[PDB]
Design a protein around this ligand. Structure first.
Ligand SMILES: Nc1ncnc2c1ncn2[C@@H]1O[C@H](COP(=O)(O)OP(=O)(O)OP(=O)(O)O)[C@@H](O)[C@H]1O
Ligand SMILES: Nc1ncnc2c1ncn2[C@@H]1O[C@H](COP(=O)(O)OP(=O)(O)OP(=O)(O)O)[C@@H](O)[C@H]1O
Ligand SMILES: [Cl-]
Ligand SMILES: [Mg+2]
Ligand SMILES: [Mg+2]
Ligand SMILES: [Mg+2]
Ligand SMILES: [Mg+2]
Lengths: 148, 180, 178
């Protein structure tokens, strides 16, 4: 099936975009770098699952999200993809992650893939978005804002 | 785990339709966000008027996104500002291109993606932009999206191409030329 | 003036002169191929030192990617378009060169290994996307099988070159962990 190869490929594409973003991290021992690396592993499991996906990593993502949200101001503006190297790269990862989601979706719904793979990808773009903001905040960057 | 509205693989348009995330509309808005993000990263390599231009373009790509997520077949009276995509930013890209073009050597051979970090990031952006044009086109040719969105993305890749060239020249980088 | 506006309505030309909508699978394959060449272009900028022979290789590969573009823009039924085996066989030689210098590998390598190596894993993914786009074209007999072969062998090249970059830099690449 072509749809499976497409979904696996786009998952790998995401993981490799994360791989490149990780290279932008200049200081050693950041916990989000650990997290991104764990996600990459999960993406490999996504890969073979597509080709039973437990809920744990979704929960993991949800607690990391909540951790970073509580450290950040409320979200009042619409931001443009920005805020420093890592941040921008994560915004790109977010876009690619959302593309992966769209590719997995028909596979679920056809019941060829565990529902949770979609949920994980859905939640991953929230993680990547949140992490981007968190990363920019910690560089004290200030992201660019929408203007007509 | 949370029960998020997107978890069963459906999302919403700005007109209230529920569609599988699979849908053309989301392929089209996703790919546009992808493009804007790529530009976001390219901006981070600015080492500048053209940096200002790239941001305005990101802002237009927001509008593009609002437009794509508002199918004309179901736009009502209050959504008219989203369904209406004015020509202005296109004329802008055109006059920007003329400006840069009048500062560049004449062009006759095929340029490979190259020219320094900013220039190469821009060539990648251009490629992503043309993918975004491919996603928008079927919405336009189905009457769901203003044709001006497509004009824009069409022109944008020529803008992004000529800026790449400009950046290369202002760094003293010669781009590679197609060989054989 | 570089823009004609003639594609402003969503249509464009194949190298046969046929007008098609821009979302036609021919354009999807050509574009994805451009995307790949652009990704290689960026990875090329991550090379610090002068005179790396792989850097010369990737640039030759960009040239072939243009040829792959043209071939794809010239679908066979509507025409006469053959893609020669040469750049494939050449890729195969370069692959052996790097492959033979590498540790035997039993792990699963996560996209990692430094900037170059990382950029090249991404390139590999985009190349694999380009393969997936070329596949329908070959199966309906619009494109020479060799074109798919080239991108396939190029996926292999980019993976193993990323391993090579990582090893030269002495940059440990990350492994799959359960
Ligand atoms: N995978 C996707 N690709 C492109 N666009 C999307 C995708 N998912 C959602 N969208 C669009 O972007 C908007 C914001 O995305 P969001 O992720 O918040 O929606 P969702 O996935 O339906 O909701 P939730 O993430 O809260 O479950 C959505 O209303 C939808 O129009
Ligand atoms: N968005 C696209 N994605 C992939 N391939 C394209 C795209 N647009 C055009 N092509 C192909 O690449 C060639 C050069 O593209 P170009 O953008 O100059 O064409 P166009 O959009 O038809 O014309 P113009 O841009 O001058 O209005 C075209 O002749 C066509 O074969
Ligand atoms: Cl795609
Ligand atoms: Mg979502
Ligand atoms: Mg949301
Ligand atoms: Mg064009
Ligand atoms: Mg042109």
């Amino acid at each position: 099936d072509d749809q499976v190869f497409e979904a696996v490929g786009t998952t790998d594409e995401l993981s490799s975009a994360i791989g490149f973003a990780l290279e932008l991290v200049t200081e050693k021992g950041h916990t989000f770098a650990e997290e991104l690396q764990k996600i990459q592993c999960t993406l490999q499991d996504v890969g073979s699952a597509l080709a039973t996906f437990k809920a744990g990593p979704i929960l993991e993502l949800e607690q990391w999200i909540d951790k970073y949200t509580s450290q950040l101001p409320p979200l009042t503006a619409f931001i443009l993809p920005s805020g420093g190297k890592i941040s921008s790269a994560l915004h790109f990862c977010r876009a690619v992650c959302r593309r992966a989601e769209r590719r997995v979706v028909p596979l679920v719904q056809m019941g060829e893939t565990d529902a949770n793979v979609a949920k994980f990808l859905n939640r991953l773009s929230d993680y990547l978005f949140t992490l981007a903001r968190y990363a920019a905040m910690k560089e004290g960057n200030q992201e660019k804002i929408y203007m007509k």
